[PDB]
Symmetry: C2
Subunit: 295 residues, 2 copies
Amino acid sequence: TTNKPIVLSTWNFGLHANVEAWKVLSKGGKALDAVEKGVRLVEDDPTERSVGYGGRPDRDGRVTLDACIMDENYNIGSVACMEHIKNPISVARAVMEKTPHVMLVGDGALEFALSQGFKKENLLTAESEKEWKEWLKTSQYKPIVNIENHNTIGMIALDAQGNLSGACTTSGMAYKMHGRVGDSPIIGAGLFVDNEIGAATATGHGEEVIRTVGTHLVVELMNQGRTPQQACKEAVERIVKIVNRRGKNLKDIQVGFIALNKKGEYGAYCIQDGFNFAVHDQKGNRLETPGFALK
Amino acid sequence: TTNKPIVLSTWNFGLHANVEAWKVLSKGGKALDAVEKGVRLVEDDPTERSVGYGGRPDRDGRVTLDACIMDENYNIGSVACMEHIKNPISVARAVMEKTPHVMLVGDGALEFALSQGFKKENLLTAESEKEWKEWLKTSQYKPIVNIENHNTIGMIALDAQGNLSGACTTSGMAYKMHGRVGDSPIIGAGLFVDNEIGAATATGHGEEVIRTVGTHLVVELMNQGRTPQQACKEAVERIVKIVNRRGKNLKDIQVGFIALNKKGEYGAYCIQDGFNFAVHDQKGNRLETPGFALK
């Protein structure tokens, strides 16, 4: 029994993102193409303020995006703190397929994007500019991650050929310091895929996922025999432990992991209730709610 | 019986870097201060062409540095593709201690550094500029990791209190594309420290260490009961397996690691021969050579 093809994505918008990914997966397409197409839908959406176009800018009014992609054979691509390109996941894929490198950041990422035909566009919408200038009044940095805030999209899929791939794209924490980079474009942090084991992607307070190399841990736990759900659970618990050891309050932190193994089994776990993920397989597309640590 | 204090650092210059770290460690100082002081020695040296001042620029003649630091209590700091600041490891430490973030890149990293009192300096030596303009005549990109090439410095130490910390700083691959980020500033790639387990830092082609989340793997292996030596080797072996899966020739890829556990035991291993690391403990400071896979 292998549940494939199957795609999982973070948060409620992962439901329609999944529909796009399924257009590829249901036709026997590659997982890599499916996750790229899936997350691009959100990058393009001006109303999704935490991914691509319309994403809230850093505290200086700059919309800088981070994204990384990983296919079924350890090929990886990443862009971080890149401006003016609506689809960082696609530039990430170009970094992976067209360069000797796996990660480009800032001006260099943009210059590369432009050299690859991507079009420079203004990603700061009127709404984001308005909210930003308003936030500037008191400049109180307090990133909240909940059902209605900082919903980064991570997507992982197992295609008909039984290959895994994943993509993660975000606009990062709203009003972050200029140049701040989270977990989303870091392989092993926001995303990790090993075709002989499984894949996992993360969302939430990036700093904490970077700190625990979250997705690599989830996949390594699955490598050790943990079910996808259990692997995610333990990774969350590791963050809970570290948050405690660092003298911080868990209520201020939200992280969710979703995972998939080679047999198409899947799971998820998060720190705080309110996190859902969308799962689409041959049975249909559904919004599911994993367990949470903070009770 | 735990062997402490003890410090390990990559390559020949690690011997001198170790002397500086020992000035802190032998006095009962913090591992964090020891590793920062240790690598800063290399950053300051213009003769060290792969770390800070005097580092070979990217293909556009820009010296952009990457660095990260991790202490004994899951605190982390990182800077990537930062220009004009000779001591990125210290800016990374500032990111860790002075901000709500763990990673800043590009202009934002420089702006933060300046806000912290770091001085803007020309890191491009006459020698580097000359070599660069000379390289421009051919523009053939071909990174080599040997005893006198791309010698990034990574350092990990266990102090008198039995606490671990690590630091990694580099100028990255010479003539890399502008904005290229290697493994050095990535937690879990170039460096990873878990005070309950051990620490590890990497050597070799950054892209490959990122791809395999090398140091997190090494530490996790140590967490699974492996000794430092075994962890570095089992990691490298898993990685050799991945390199083959990607249809690449092992001779073109160098990936190695040095590790230390909570008991002061240490180890090192690489895909290829020719790498060396410096170890300093109560027996003194010396250069040792790791086992290697490519026979």
